[PDB]
Amino acid sequence: MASLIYRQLLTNSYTVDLSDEIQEIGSTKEMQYNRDITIRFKFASSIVKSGGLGYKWSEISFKPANYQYTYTRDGEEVTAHTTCSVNGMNDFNFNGGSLPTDFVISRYEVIKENSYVYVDYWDDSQAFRNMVYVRSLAANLNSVICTGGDYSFALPVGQWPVMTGGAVSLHSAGVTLSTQFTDFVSLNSLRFRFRLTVEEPSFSITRTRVSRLYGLPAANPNNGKEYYEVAGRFSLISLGELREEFNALSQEIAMSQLIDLALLPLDMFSMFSGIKSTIDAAKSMATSVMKKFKKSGLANSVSTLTDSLSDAASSISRGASIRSVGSSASAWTDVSTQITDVSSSVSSISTQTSTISRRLRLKEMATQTEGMNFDDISAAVLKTKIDRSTQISPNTLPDIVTEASEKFIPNRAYRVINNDEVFEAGTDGRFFAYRVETFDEIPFDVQKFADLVTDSPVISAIIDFKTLKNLNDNYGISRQQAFNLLRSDPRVLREFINQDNPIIRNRIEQLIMQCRL
């Protein structure tokens, strides 16, 4: 369960980039409210002549244009402002020749089906001003046809060429967010963009060689109209410190109900379901949550073990001297056996065990093992509280999740059975040796340990010795059960905690209290 969710992430990080790379290109260089809407707008043009005799034009282009107006909606007069701009315009030209007396248009813009028209809109009602958290918005608008008027090119001598025709229809396409910054204040808006379809009539330039072209030129796109209008309706659907609360919020999680929710592959789609946000948060956020992971504890560490294998299997000819408590070199055992890069205070064994725990432990998880794996107790903690909070906003979800990994279940140990011998690497401190059956302790070994750890399945000892031996005596514990209570079987464990209620309910609970972060 947690197994996935966690790992599932580091698996899908490669994505982080692609997405990341988008917002750049694109980056720079509750309560519902309704309202029919009337969008009136117009284009503007810039026409620049070349110098010389006066037969040549250098540029005919679109320019943003503002419009202001008032209309009635629900018995109230609404004042609205719009700004119309275009994107993806096409550069055309006309070359009548290189003589000073030959008609030329060096560059004129035309909007076609690969172009967009944007109309920014603001009005003075109250629902509009109260839009700062937006969970969702759709518009149902009529289309409008924009047709080109004539534009005469007044040559110094003779008959004047005239650009005429051209037309496109505008269709509501995609709804976003947006905001206008003028000399002092801001005008929130979710400017829609219109996709275009070319329409009749085509355009041409009389007296020349330009006819039967489709699209709308920038020469006279308003065709003498005071404005173009698109009307319809739109519907809107609307809605350090952190830690100290997570902790307290944990002190209540049930027991049985928890465990279970650690036998359910709470993967990707699951975790970011409950969250309810304004926009593409949880989305690029499930991606940001990523763009946090690949930059933290769990990350690098795992990235290390990985190499420590390659490097030590690739080297060999020059295998690191290191050292190995066990048959032979093998990252897991040895690399920890030697790079006891920290120091002072107690006894031998414990130190390696420990350092061999670090890798072995936490680390192991994100790969292969049985029964409820620590983390799957952690995930449970998360998918829990991260729901009993309700929040939305981006800057939160990331990190906090990550950080959960690095700081959950500070310590914890593991075990490896083999011939009825529970070998328990009590991380940090301790280590014991069983006789599986009659819960007993005989000299533990750094050796027998070495290997049997390296390449065999491990177990995230839910309950360890302490709890176990104390459990075995004041109860019974059939050989049957026991054998399961080791593999950290879901069932058999769930039973007790659910049924009996003695000890077991502390070894468990205590862990919850430990994933306090």
Partner: protein, 269 residues
């Protein structure tokens, strides 16, 4: 953090690897040079260029600082070592040798001082480690040894024209008198400050790097000893850009010859 002492000696034999990777992350490096050094470099961005070069050797941008002493006398006088690790560049000026020796003796070592009132109490040094370190604008110290009666010996405790002059207008002076003898002191307190210091531990920081000559320096106040420490390095002289390149190319080597101060470590009492 502090007070008491006895470590276990078992040979666990586990060296904790690297050590330069904690100093790159957590420590500051302060480079002291003379004006002439920078003037010869003649760039408005030399401090900057060297800093990027310092990332190579492993010191994060905001890590290294560049302090300009313009003379050995002022530097000797304004000693408020700013960073964790201080490596001071000294240029061989042959007339200023003792000025340099007195300054080295101060940085390279750990000092303990108390204030002296030359006006009201005639003092005496106690052991080979009790010295009088005075410094300021113009330090001029005249002394008058007292016999066991508070009477002069070769002087009249009344007229300083009979005193014995042992320093004529220095910027830093470590004065030494025959141990176990009282002396009426006559310093020019107007421009000088004289304090009674007890020496001791050597410094786990500075690293006086000497440019030029083919010196041999001389601290020990005595004649019998000559101590040569690791925090006393040398670079034959010629071009300043080269000096700095070397200091950068061997930062760790230089830092390793120093480390954590010790007298300033938190863990004290």
């Amino acid at each position: 953090y502090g007070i008491n002492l006895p470590i276990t000696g078992s040979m666990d034999t586990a060296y904790a690897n690297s050590t330069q990777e904690e100093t790159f992350l957590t420590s500051t490096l302060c480079l002291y040079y003379p004006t002439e050094a920078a003037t010869e470099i003649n760039d408005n961005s030399w401090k900057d260029t060297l800093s990027q070069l310092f990332l190579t050797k492993g010191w994060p941008t905001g890590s290294v600082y560049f302090k300009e002493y313009t003379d050995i006398a002022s530097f000797s006088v304004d000693p408020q070592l700013y960073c964790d690790y201080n490596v001071v560049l000294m240029k061989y000026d042959a007339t200023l040798q003792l000025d340099m020796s007195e300054l080295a003796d101060l940085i390279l070592n750990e000092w303990l001082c108390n204030p002296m009132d030359i006006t009201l109490y005639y003092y005496q040094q106690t052991d080979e480690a009790n010295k009088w370190i005075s410094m300021g604008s113009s330090c001029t110290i005249k002394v008058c040894p007292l016999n066991t009666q508070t009477l002069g010996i070769g002087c009249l405790t009344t007229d300083t024209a009979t005193f014995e002059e042992v320093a004529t207008a220095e910027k830093l002076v470590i004065t030494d008198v025959v141990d176990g003898v009282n002396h009426k002191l006559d310093v020019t307190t107007a421009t000088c400050t004289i304090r009674n210091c007890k020496k001791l531990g050597p410094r786990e920081n500075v690293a006086v790097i000497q440019v030029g000559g083919s010196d041999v320096l001389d601290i020990t106040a005595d004649p019998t000893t000559a101590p040569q420490t690791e925090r006393m390095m040398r670079i034959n002289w010629k071009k300043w850009w080269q000096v700095f390149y070397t200091v950068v190319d061997y930062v760790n080597q230089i830092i390793q010859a120093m480390s954590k101060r010790s007298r300033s470590l938190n863990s004290a009492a």
